[PDB]
Amino acid sequence: HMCDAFVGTWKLVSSENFDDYMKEVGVGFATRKVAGMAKPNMIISVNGDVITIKSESTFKNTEISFILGQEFDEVTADDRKVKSTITLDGGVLVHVQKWDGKSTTIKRKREDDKLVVECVMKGVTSTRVYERA
């Protein structure tokens, strides 16, 4: 029942500072422009200890399945090959991505009827807000 309140289909309703976050991550111009247009759906499900997060978007479709605390390989929407670890900290999913000596952290939390995604790269944050589809 660890992630019950995350389970479902969520649609992006707002984004702030995503372009600057992507710049800080190292995403190139064309990918930033096309990725920034997208209004993805995020589909979260749980089966036993395995959590699956899918992103359905006009830019890129992605899927990760993972066990909390157990590192896995991930190919991000912007095509980075990263090593990811996701934990639960005080009811927040905390996702750390490592690649090329770099690191970024994505936090996912429930707040009222929304799922709020905070992406942090050094000093730069982007906030993406989703509502139930």
Q: Where residue 22 sits, what CATH number does that domain have?
A: 2.40.128.20
Annotated binding residue at 128?
Answer: yes
Residue 21 annotated as lining a ligand binding site: no
What is the per-residue DSSP string for the chain?
A: -TTGGG-EEEEEEEEESHHHHHHHHT--HHHHHHHHH---EEEEEEETTEEEEEEE-SS--EEEEE-TT--EEEE-TT--EEEEEEEEETTEEEEEEEETTEEEEEEEEEETTEEEEEEEETTEEEEEEEEE-
Give the number of other Cβ atoms within 10 Å of residue 51's Cβ.
21
Q: Work out how many domains the chain is built from and give that number.
A: 1
Calculate the alpha carbon distances from 67 to 36, 87, 93, 133 in Å: 29, 9, 12, 25
Look at residues 132, 42, 25, 27 and name the one whose alpha carbon lies nearest to residue 93. Answer: 42
Q: Which residues contact 39 (CB under 8 A, 6 or more apart)?
A: 11, 12, 57, 58
Phi then psi dihedrals of residue 93, to 5 deg: -80, 120
Q: Name which of 5, 39, 38 is nearest 113 in CA terms.
A: 5
Is 129 known as a binding-site position?
A: yes
What is the span of the domain harbouring residue 124?
Answer: 4-129
How many other CB atoms are found less than 10 A from the CB of residue 132?
Answer: 10
